[PDB]
Amino acid sequence: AGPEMVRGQVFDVGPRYTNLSYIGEGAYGMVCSAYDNVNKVRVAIKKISPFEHQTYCQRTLREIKILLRFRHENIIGINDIIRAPTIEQMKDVYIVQDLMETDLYKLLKTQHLSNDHICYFLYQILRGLKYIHSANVLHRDLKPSNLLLNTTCDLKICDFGLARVATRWYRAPEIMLNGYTKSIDIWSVGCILAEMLSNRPIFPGKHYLDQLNHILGILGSPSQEDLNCIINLKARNYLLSLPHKNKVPWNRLFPNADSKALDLLDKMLTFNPHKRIEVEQALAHPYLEQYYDPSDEPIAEAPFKFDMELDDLPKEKLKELIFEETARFQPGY
Ligand SMILES: CN(C)Cc1cccc(Nc2ncc(Cl)c(-c3csc(C(=O)NN4CCOCC4)c3)n2)c1
């Protein structure tokens, strides 16, 4: 019996992995669960087909190298990698990882979170993000659909394809001019907090202009100091063209949320990245006092550093590096 297929997509991961089930898909990849007939468990498998585009090749190499170096309870790992025995044959790369029960996206579509769970999930997101930022890496695309949850309420951050060393509903406002710094991740976590408090996106713009209006609709018109953070000229001009907007207090939007939760949300969703809170201070905020435990919150031993200029490399070079990096999982290595 030939190779497995999932929604007309071949999934050439047997004989070890079988009984595939669709989970989701991105721009150049698909995710399924499968049965691992060695460890007698179900696993997650992300198929990645990036080699047509230099950008996809950089993100794939970055994703693999970062996830193989990171070792943290709140961050998805890589257990196995499958690809063809020769570089000429390699069209796809399959990354095998721990299977989780669901993601925060789906959870928030069907469940109301107690203040306790919101607190505990927020702690874990930030605890993972502390490890991440401690290594001088940015995730850059945190969102409910890549925060994974287990039966026992354990959370893991996944999809590091966009990560870099230091929808669009979670993009910080600095980015909607563009400057990727650690504070864009805190913005995303702020938006995630809001969504956990209400079950609806806080800034659900149809496009970037419409997202800016949502943001200003709650934060109010930016100050002049805040306007000096907005480097891009079209954006700055646009902001200067708008009528004044008043700041809406957080407890009017979330009338039944914990006061501490709202005080932290306020500091995470701050227009000016320079004044936005940082991950350790977030973790030490009173709202999180029930879980904050710096004695058991690991950081990376050293800053992550790429020794090559991936941006500069032609997609053929990248593919060779991807062949190299995945060698160690190939039989007979
Ligand atoms: C419906 N039934 C399947 C339940 C369910 C629902 C969602 C998740 C999981 N479990 C799980 N376990 C391990 C992993 Cl590794 C992943 C995973 C999902 S997506 C992804 C990634 O890399 N995704 N990117 C592309 C898609 O958009 C987001 C980013 C990794 N999921 C189970």
Task: Give residue 101 CA to ligand 1 midpoint distance, Å.
Answer: 9
Which of 21, 23, 169 for mutating ligand 1's site (highest number of atoms within 8 Å of CB)? 23
Listed in sequence order, the DSSP H helices in 172-249 are 183-198, 208-219, 224-227, 233-241
- What do you get for the CA distance between the two ends of the chain, in Å? 27
Exposure pattern of 222-240 as b/e (b: 16+ CB <10 Å)? beeebeebbeeeebeebbe
CA distance 159 to 81: 15
Task: Give residue 24 CA to ligand 1 midpoint distance, Å.
Answer: 6
CA 284, 288, 294, 300 torsion-angle sign: negative
> φ and ψ at 227, to 5 degrees?
-65, -25
CA atoms within 13 A on the CB side of 262: 13
Contact yes or no for 47/11 (Cβ under 8 A): yes
CA distance 159 to 77: 10
Contact yes or no for 293/73 (Cβ under 8 A): no
Residues of the chain with CATH 3.30.200.20: 7-99+314-331
The residues, any chain, with a CB within 8 Å of residue 151's CB and separated by 6 or more, are 101
Task: Give residue 45 CA to ligand 1 midpoint distance, Å.
Answer: 9
Q: Find tokens 């790429």 and name the residue.
A: 306
Which atom belonging to ligand 1 lies closest to the Cα atom of 24? 26
What pairing do the DSSP bridges indicate for beta strands 41-48 and 29-36?
antiparallel
Instruction: Identify whether 92 is a catalytic site residue.
Output: no
Which atom belonging to ligand 1 lies closest to the Cα atom of 159? 22
> φ and ψ at 185, to 5 degrees?
-70, -40
> φ and ψ at 85, to 5 degrees?
-70, -20
Binding-site sequence positions for ATP: 23-31, 46
> φ and ψ at 164, to 5 degrees?
-155, 155
Closest CA to 54 of 322, 236, 276, 255: 322
Hey, what's the torsion of the CAs at 221, 224, 229, 235, to 10 degrees? 60
Which atom belonging to ligand 1 lies closest to the Cα atom of 33? 3
Way it was determined:
X-ray
Which of 148, 156, 157, 160 for mutating ligand 1's site (highest number of atoms within 8 Å of CB)? 148
CA distance 319 to 232: 34
Task: Give residue 22 CA to ligand 1 midpoint distance, Å.
Answer: 10
Q: Which residues pair with 47 in a beta bridge?
A: 30, 94
Binding-site sequence positions: 23-31, 46
Task: Give residue 290 CA to ligand 1 midpoint distance, Å.
Answer: 29
CATH architecture assigned to 100-313:
Orthogonal Bundle (1.10)
CA distance 38 to 30: 23
DSSP 232-276: -HHHHHHHHHSPP-PPPPHHHHSTTS-HHHHHHHHHHS-SSGGGS
DSSP 286-310: GGGTTT--GGG----SS----SS-G
Closest protein CA for atom 23 of ligand 1: 159
CA distance 269 to 313: 36
Catalytically annotated residue among 141, 159, 185, 226: 141
- Ligand 1 binding residues, C-beta < 6 A: 23-24, 26, 31, 44, 46, 76, 97, 99-100, 102-103, 106, 145-146, 148, 158-159
**Token pair listed for 29:** 């990849």
CA 314, 315, 320, 326 torsion-angle sign: positive
In CATH, which superfamily holds the domain spanning 7-99+314-331?
Answer: Phosphorylase Kinase; domain 1 (3.30.200.20)
Closest protein CA for atom 32 of ligand 1: 102
**Token pair listed for 268:** 């995470």
> φ and ψ at 149, to 5 degrees?
-125, 145
CA distance 190 to 106: 19
Radius of gyration from C-alpha coordinates of the chain: 21
Closest protein CA for atom 4 of ligand 1: 102
Closest CA to 279 of 142, 155, 127: 127
Closest CA to 321 of 332, 307, 301: 307
CA distance 12 to 15: 9
- Amino acid, res. 28: Y
Task: Give residue 189 CA to ligand 1 midpoint distance, Å.
Answer: 18
Angstrom resolution of this structure: 2.1
Residues of the chain with CATH 1.10.510.10: 100-313
Which of 100, 149, 162 for mutating ligand 1's site (highest number of atoms within 8 Å of CB)? 100
Segment holding 19, helix H or strand E: strand 17-25
Contact yes or no for 143/170 (Cβ under 8 A): yes
